[PDB]
Amino acid sequence: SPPLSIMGLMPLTKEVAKGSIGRGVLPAVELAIEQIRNESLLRPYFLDLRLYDTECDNAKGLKAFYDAIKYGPNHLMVFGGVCPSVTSIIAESLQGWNLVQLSFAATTPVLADKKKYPYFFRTVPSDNAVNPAILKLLKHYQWKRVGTLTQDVQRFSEVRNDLTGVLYGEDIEISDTESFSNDPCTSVKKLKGNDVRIILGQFDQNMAAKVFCCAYEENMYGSKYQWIIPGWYEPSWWERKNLLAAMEGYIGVDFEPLSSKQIKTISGKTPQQYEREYNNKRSGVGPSKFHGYAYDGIWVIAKTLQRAMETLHASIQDFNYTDHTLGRIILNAMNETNFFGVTGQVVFRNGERMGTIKFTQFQDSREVKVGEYNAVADTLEIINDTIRFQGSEPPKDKTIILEQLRKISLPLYSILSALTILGMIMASAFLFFNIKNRNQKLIKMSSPYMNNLIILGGMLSYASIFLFGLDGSFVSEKTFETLCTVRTWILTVGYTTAFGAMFAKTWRVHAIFKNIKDQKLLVIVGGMLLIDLCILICWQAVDPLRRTVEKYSMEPDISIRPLLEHCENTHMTIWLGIVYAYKGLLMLFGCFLAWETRNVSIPALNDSKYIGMSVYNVGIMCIIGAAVSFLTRDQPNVQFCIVALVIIFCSTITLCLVFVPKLITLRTN
């Protein structure tokens, strides 16, 4: 019968390393042709396939094409082309000879430019079909942040530049982007610094091991990091321990060589029957993962040739290459094909095919399949009980921030507030005892009111300790901003009055020793009080102290950043220095007089020695307190307790040393 001829271009030799792709698919073509012939679908005509080698060389490829055009018979189509350097040359020279091409192994995106390559169709999906799957893997698991690593080659840039274009409508946002050529570890470090947990890699076999090693060296792996990389590598490419620990947990992506679904296809078989037929047809020839596409190519070419032969009869053996109408007919016939095949259902959205992508995961020995994403339906399917994580929750692209206050714990605040009452009760008792004996000779000899002033000062100082503690969520936020002022006022007055009296008495003594009475002491104490009153008024009226918050720590699974509050103002160094200097100078002056007058004295005043001891004690106590304050401001709990102890001892030993003898003297006499 009259034959219909077809051209074939593929490597066949053994020196070329890609000859395997031309030897591991011919059995499928033989099977398909045998079936087409037996079924008798082209009644008068039959097919006749012709083989031509290229060696995957630009020159060695053109010469074969040309020789075929000259010697060989009148061809009608071109079938094949695995190497991208020669097929990209041949695909542009078809509008002149009026031919059509069908490639099943070229996965380059350039061939999608339908301005230069209008007569090019293929089945195998391109490498720019992985991103619409990565997208719906991100959405499903609620991820937003990403880190992309690009290698400096056009193969990978051709998709790195297509990824950024599909995320426009979506909400994902590119956080970082690092590129490298030979040294990936600098980029790995620049990424680990940005604190990212999502990585989208694009690199070849070796650079994978390189980046894994340098990431382990950078500690960029664990239950808080996710890996995404290609998955078309060869098994056992790792051909140490540490490396395998940084690799596990990565997801690879490829295209599905052969569907698993069981359904009746157009050849009256099923994907599981054809697999056995093929594995039994080839004995020595090794396996290639492209046969499912050749088998479908044969059937699509037959179907379209028939559908075109139909329209031709209503108007094929002498087709000189100057036939434009026939070429247009065949082209418009190929755009209307849809059926079911071992690989799935075949459709053509502007040459490019709409097929199925598949994910895979590595679990300590090899990659295992997980999910299949079907492009023509936009539906993602996952299987459970096979995917796993390092943690029990889907990691996220962020870190949790916590704000602990460090406030007091109140195991001892109550204890101290209670101990503060002993002093108050003792002071009340002593004041009453002194008020009761206001007529005896002992109470009449010593100063009448100076002791009362001292006791009042002590009680006022005692209140200050109560005011110190309230902080760290004890009171409303609007209260802390109003307690510092009253606190400092109270403490100032309390320290002022008592020491004013304890100093005026020694002054009167020293003056009498060298050369009304009760009035001059009150006057000088009032003046000392006036100084501090004016100072405090000026401050409270100019710039009060406001509550400021400080954050300083990093305690790591959410990170916690603690916060604290400080009642300060900007200009604190001058204020503090002046106040401290003024009080220290007064204390030293008072202390010197007492030492000078240790033995000498004036009659009608029996409390000279004891008041001197009190002055010494108060001076040392205040010095220690002030020193401790500057040293332990970070730790708030210990400072509070030590300051409270200091205040208690200072304000209690004084009274216990002044009144006690005057009391036991009456108790005994």
């Binding site: 020159a59 053109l62 010469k63 040309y66 040359i89 542009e92 020279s93 509008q95 002149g96 230069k116």
Partner: protein, 676 residues
């Protein structure tokens, strides 16, 4: 009869470079002129078969089939463009052919592992870079920046430029690319303040990027732009409906921009092999066109088509043998390769010689824009490192700028007159001190002086004298010292002042101390009290100088302006953590200085023997304390200034010394002189 010889050619007539409108007639004329003469090829005629290609590789392979498998048999193939020459040069290896292209300017065709039978006349685009760097060197530039539209030619060009510039002690800074968005890449130049710029792109990219420039104000006197020259004059006075700027706004943005170029026509009027002059050739082929030579295409490239078909005949004459050429044998082609590899002669374009990679070398030309018109500046021949300037360049600032603003460091000093008077007063002070010491030591046997401690007074005088002397090294800095003899001054200052102050105050305090004590006086005890304080002071000073010495410390404050920036640097003779030492030494002295005043305010009226001058000592102690107290904080707070921190510390010492030495020593003279 003459045995014929055919060749094949592909001429473009439409596309991105229609260079066949004017390169076909030239080669036809060459063929007829070389066939007329009977001195080159006697019995071998030449003929040509030409096809069209439109400068796209889709038609080219179809026509190459139509031209390589149908008789007759061809020998030499001539492709025009750079997108259909690559193809044929890759493919011809299997047919054993030679290719000679007259219009391809791509640096990738210079390889010899893929293209082993390729020759051309149009030089490459890697021939501007030697000129560029030999010109940078001439004007001392070491920091460059560049931007490039996206394409293979420009990428390879910039790569070669980087390789050539990274081998003569120069460094590159920035490389920004684009396709049609020149906004952000030109805006990101000001962010780095780049001034020397080389720009590689087509005309429209220019008319756009330059409006962007004018908007961003990237031009002036500190900006130099390098460009490429084949743009047509008047390329900025043309309407641009896709542009907002105007003509006069842009004509001020492209002022004074260099531009190189390659020259194809012999600028001289010397004759050549064919006995022809450039003027006798231009008009000769202009009498053979349809449109005008300003509206046609590929006119300035014809000389390279003429000067090529002559090389072929020259190298084919030697071989003389050709009627039997099959596409399989590879000996005839090797002979022709050896013949073409040894070419040297003169043509309408000059001396043509092929380098190792097929290409040829030529002279290049330089220009510059001077008022809406280009004005030549010089030529260059990269074969003999030659050059030919003209002394016609121009600059706005009478000279060309440099890569970056240089910073000059300045040093501040004192007035140089406030020091002389203050260093003079010290001499008077020391004279008074010596006079008083002499007056007190002369009389040494009277009871009036035996009562009041003479030794203590003398010690006070010695201390004051040392303090007065210590003032000299305090102002000596800069004009009167270098970087080597600097540390010798600080030690002087310290060891003089910290000695004199204490050596005086020791007596001036211990006297009142023992007085007030007895007021609540063996001579031996008094010496121990004084010696103790000085002994303590030396300990602190020695421990400071041992475990913490002072060498130097510069201070760099704000950089004032004058294209030169000046940053002034100070010079503090300091150390590490001096605040603590100064605080210690100031407090430990303020204690005594504030205690003695009270002690004196106490023993105001007490009377004793050998304690007569106690009131005078009290007055002296009153003045010293106030002066020292005021001066120390002020000096500490004014460490930045240089004049104030000298007055407030040089007056407060001479005043104290004088008021001290003219109080407890004046009455002695006023009395012993009036009473003999």
């Amino acid at each position: 009869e003459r045995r014929a010889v055919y060749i094949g050619a592909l001429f473009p007539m439409s596309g991105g470079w229609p260079g066949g409108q004017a390169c076909q007639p030239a080669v036809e004329m060459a063929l007829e002129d070389v066939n007329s003469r009977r001195d080159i090829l006697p019995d071998y005629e030449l003929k040509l078969i030409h096809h069209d290609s439109k400068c796209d590789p889709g038609q080219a392979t179809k026509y190459l089939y139509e031209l390589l498998y149908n008789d007759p048999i061809k020998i030499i193939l001539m492709p025009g463009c750079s997108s259909v020459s690559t193809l044929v040069a890759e493919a011809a290896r299997m047919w054993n052919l030679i290719v000679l292209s007259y219009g391809s300017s791509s640096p990738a065709l210079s390889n010899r592992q893929r293209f082993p039978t390729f020759f051309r006349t149009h030089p490459s685009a890697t021939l501007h870079n030697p000129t560029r760097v030999k010109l940078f060197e001439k004007w001392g530039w070491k920091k460059i920046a560049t931007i490039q539209q996206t394409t293979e030619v420009f990428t390879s060009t910039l790569d070669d430029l980087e390789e050539r510039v990274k081998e003569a002690g120069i460094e590159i800074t920035f490389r920004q690319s684009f396709f049609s968005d020149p906004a952000v890449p030109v805006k990101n130049l000001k962010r780095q303040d780049a001034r020397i710029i080389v720009g590689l792109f087509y005309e429209t990219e220019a008319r756009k990027v330059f409006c962007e420039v004018y908007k961003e104000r990237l031009f002036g006197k500190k900006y130099v732009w390098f460009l490429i020259g084949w743009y047509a004059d008047n390329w900025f006075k043309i309407y641009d409906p896709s542009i907002n700027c105007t003509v006069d706004e842009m004509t001020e943005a492209v002022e004074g921009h260099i531009t190189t170029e390659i020259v194809m026509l012999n600028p001289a009027n010397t004759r050549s092999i064919s006995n022809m002059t450039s003027q006798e050739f231009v008009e000769k082929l202009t009498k053979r066109l349809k449109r005008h030579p300003e509206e046609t295409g590929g006119f300035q490239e014809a000389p390279l088509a003429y000067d090529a078909i002559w090389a072929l005949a020259l190298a084919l004459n030697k071989t003389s043998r050709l009627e039997d050429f099959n596409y399989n044998n590879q000996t005839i082609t090797d002979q022709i390769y050896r013949a073409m590899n040894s070419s040297s002669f003169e043509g309408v374009s000059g001396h043509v010689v092929f380098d190792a990679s097929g290409s040829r070398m030529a002279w290049t030309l330089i220009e510059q824009l001077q008022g809406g018109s280009y004005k030549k500046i010089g030529y260059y021949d990269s074969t003999k490192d030659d050059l030919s300037w003209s002394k016609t360049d121009k600059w706005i600032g009478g000279s060309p700028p440099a890569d970056q603003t240089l910073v000059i460091k300045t040093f501040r000093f004192l007035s140089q007159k406030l020091f002389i008077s203050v260093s003079v007063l010290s001499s008077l002070g020391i004279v008074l001190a010596v006079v008083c010491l002499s007056f007190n030591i002369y009389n040494s046997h009277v009871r009036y002086i035996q009562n009041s401690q003479p030794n203590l007074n003398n010690l006070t005088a010695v201390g004051c004298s040392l303090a007065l002397a210590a003032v000299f090294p305090l102002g000596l800095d800069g004009y009167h010292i270098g970087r080597n003899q600097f540390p010798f001054v600080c030690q002087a200052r310290l060891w003089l002042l910290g000695l004199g102050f204490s050596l005086g105050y020791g007596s001036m305090f211990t006297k009142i101390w023992w007085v007030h004590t007895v007021f609540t006086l063996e001579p031996w005890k008094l010496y121990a009290t004084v010696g103790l304080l000085v002994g303590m002071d030396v300990l602190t000073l020695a421990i400071w100088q041992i475990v913490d010495p002072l060498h130097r410390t510069i201070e760099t404050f704000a950089k004032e302006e004058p294209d030169v920036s000046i940053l002034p640097q100070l010079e503090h003779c300091s150390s590490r953590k001096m605040n603590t030492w100064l605080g210690i030494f100031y407090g430990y002295k303020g204690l005594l200085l504030l205690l003695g005043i009270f002690l004196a305010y106490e023993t105001k009226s007490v009377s004793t023997e050998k304690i007569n001058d106690h009131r005078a000592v009290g007055m002296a102690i009153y003045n010293v304390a106030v002066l020292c107290l005021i001066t120390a904080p002020v000096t500490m707070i004014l460490s930045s200034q240089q004049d104030a921190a000298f007055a407030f510390a040089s007056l407060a010492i001479v005043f104290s010394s004088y008021i001290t030495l003219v109080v407890l020593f004046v009455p002695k003279m006023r009395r012993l002189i009036t009473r003999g």
